[PDB]
Design a protein around this nucleic acid. Structure first.
Lengths: 228, 148, 71
RNA sequence: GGGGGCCUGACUGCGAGGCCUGCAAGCCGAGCAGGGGCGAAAGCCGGGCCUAGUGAACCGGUGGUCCCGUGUGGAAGGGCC
RNA sequence: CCUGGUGUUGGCUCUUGGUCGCGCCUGCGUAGGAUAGGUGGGAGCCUGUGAACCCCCGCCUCCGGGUGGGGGGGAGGCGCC
RNA sequence: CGGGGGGAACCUGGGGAACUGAAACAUCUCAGUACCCAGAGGAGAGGAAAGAGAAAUCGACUCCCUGAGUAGCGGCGAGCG
RNA sequence: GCCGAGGUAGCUCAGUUGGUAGAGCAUGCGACUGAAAAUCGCAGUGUCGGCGGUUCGAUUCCGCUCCUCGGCACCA
């Protein structure tokens, strides 16, 4: 009973028997793993739903009210001052129907698409074709369409994350920084607690937030109790 | 079904138990017999009757044991042997101890429980280990010498 | 009288019905049973001292005969 | 009656008063108020060109209500739409 | 009358199925060094093999190969790129 | 030492019915009625509250009037009450 | 109305990553068939009952919908 991971020391730190609580989690994670740089600790969990009927395929976003400037690239598709507002705020990819055109040709360097209502027809119908069957098309009920382009990418770089559940039923997201202030990490674990509880479709019946854990990139695995 | 055991331990393993033998099962199957009874403040009492009983009996054993333990570990036991400056002609049998101490000095102890691999005939004396009760072993100064 | 109980009396009566529900799930029941019935217990024994029996009925039975098990 | 533009009154609360009528039926309705909709507007629109496309009462369901609850705060249940 | 459950209707043992908990192994359409099961976090990882060179063995099949151990030892390999 | 066998109507408990009504007739009504029975009497019946009741209130049982034919029971039908 | 069930080419059966489809039998052409059937070779040959949908992609995965068959409680 021994495995292949010098992780051995750190795992020794671990000890799966008590799914404990948030702040504890911030601290133990923080101590747990600063490999070659500082851990990109994160949170992962699963929900008692069932995507075979998208009536619960959840996603949205809780703005971890803490600094950033990375993750899931985004294209701000609009016109003039919206391009201003958006790129400004903090947009990886920025433009209008010419950037969309680039997409038609062969460019979707943007995982997510945030288009304002001044190019929504062009985005959704030009790129309806291109971005529809994947999920990279701005949708007026999918955190992807809004005149608030600057506010939007603003968040994208000041402190963004967002949600989305993968196949079988789980969600993946960053709820704090490794070495980051523990209490803080708690603040974010919660940010997620809330936003999630929110997104949580009404097609539930029992244990919804089934397993909620603070775990790290390449590091430890600690189940947690985001109730307290 | 508070089944009280007379001769049971899930076999004739007697008193010392009470288990559940489901309805009739228990009834006429496991206790009609001559192997047990059932609850009753009466039977429970029974358990108390001899639990107490034995608690006092054993307690006692302990006690009388103690009186002898003390008297004997206290006193010395000298015996009139006959012979040369080593082993007497026909040994010191710890039973020799037994009756000699018994009625020439006062208290008796059965031969058996003592500490005598081979009778000892060296003479002189040794204080040895003879356990009058198995948690309480009585040691004592046994001297025999040629009154030749 | 040849089968009340012995460890008291359980020997009789009753009129019994029947229909077909749907009450608090859909509509009214359905009733058409002006019927009549029996309804009873059972018998057994043990020994005073080589020689005995019992007779008796069911429950009141069982713990009862136990009572005489006390004596 | 043939075509085209916009639009839903194929409205609620209501209807004075008349048609046949023993019953309950069924039938016609100016105008009043909120509220729209067609016209610029004199106004017309509470279904269709009309007479047949039909069923009391019960029991029970469902979308409101937020009236009653058997002590009382509830609730099952319950009354009305 | 036949007919599950259940009550008196107790013992010993052979046994096979579902379900939840934990553990293991598992995913080969084509491009893909290559049998990519998902979706995360993510350029770093490791030295009880001093090495991916070779050795057998245990295991799962759709050629290869994936995986888990024992051994042979003299700073390399692999992930990133 | 007692019972038993009686006794017109009366009483308690056991068991327990069609007509007829519902202008049919099956829940229902006639009814817990007629009838078979056991049993106490001179009367049996019931008889100090796990009662009634919502005001911090009554207080065994029985019977007469009243309480309502209301509260209500129900092919919410005949009716019952 | 409930649940188990059948529905694709002329006849009738097939797949749980779905992600690539028919097959046995008739129909067309060609050898063996000196006749024939039978045989073999080939071809032709299709929405997997309807629609969207989870779905890069699933017709077998998600929900509702036709006509159907088997067994249950509906109108009192």
């Amino acid at each position: 009973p021994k495995h292949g991971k010098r992780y051995r020391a750190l795992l020794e730190k671990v000890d799966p028997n008590k799914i404990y609580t948030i702040d504890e989690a911030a601290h133990l994670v923080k101590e747990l793993a600063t490999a070659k740089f500082d851990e990109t600790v994160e949170v992962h969990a699963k929900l008692g739903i069932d995507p075979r009927r998208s009536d619960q395929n959840v996603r949205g976003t809780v703005s971890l009210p803490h600094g950033l400037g990375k993750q899931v690239r985004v294209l701000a598709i609009a016109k003039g001052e919206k391009i201003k507002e958006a790129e400004e705020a903090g947009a990886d990819y920025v433009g209008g129907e010419e950037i969309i055109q680039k997409i038609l040709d062969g460019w979707m360097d943007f995982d997510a698409v945030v288009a304002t209502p001044d190019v929504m027809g062009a985005v959704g119908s030009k790129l309806g074709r291109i971005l529809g069957p994947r999920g990279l098309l701005p949708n007026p009920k999918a955190g992807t369409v809004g005149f608030n382009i600057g506010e939007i990418i603003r968040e994208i770089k000041a402190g963004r994350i967002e949600f989305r559940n993968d196949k079988t039923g789980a969600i993946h997201a960053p709820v704090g920084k490794a070495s980051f202030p523990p209490e803080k990490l708690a603040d974010n674990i919660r940010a997620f607690i809330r936003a999630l509880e929110a997104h949580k479709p009404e097609g539930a019946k029992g244990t919804f937030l089934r397993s909620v854990y603070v775990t790290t990139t390449m590091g430890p695995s600690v189940r947690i109790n985001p109730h307290s | 079904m508070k089944v009280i055991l007379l001769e049971p331990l899930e076999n004739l393993g007697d008193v010392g138990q009470v288990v559940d033998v489901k309805p009739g099962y228990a009834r006429n199957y496991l206790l009609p017999r001559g192997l047990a009874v059932l609850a009753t403040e009466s039977n429970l009492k029974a358990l108390e009757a001899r639990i107490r009983a034995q608690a006092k009996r054993l307690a006692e054993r302990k006690a009388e044991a103690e009186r002898l333990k003390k008297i004997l570990e206290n006193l010395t036991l000298t015996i009139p042997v006959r012979a040369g400056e080593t082993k007497i002609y026909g040994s010191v049998t710890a039973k020799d101890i037994a009756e000699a101490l018994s009625r020439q000095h006062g208290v008796t102890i059965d031969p058996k429980r003592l500490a005598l691999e081979k009778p000892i005939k060296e003479l002189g004396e040794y204080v040895l280990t003879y356990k009058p009760h198995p948690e309480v072993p009585i040691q004592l100064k046994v001297s025999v010498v040629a009154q030749e | 009288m040849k089968e009340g109980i012995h460890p008291k009396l359980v020997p009789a009566r009753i009129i019994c019905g029947c229909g077909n529900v749907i009450e608090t799930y859909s509509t009214k029941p359905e009733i058409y049973v002006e019927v009549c019935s029996k309804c009873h217990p059972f018998y057994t024994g043990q020994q005073r001292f080589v020689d005995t029996e019992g007779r008796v009925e069911r429950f009141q039975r069982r713990y009862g005969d136990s009572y005489r098990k006390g004596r």
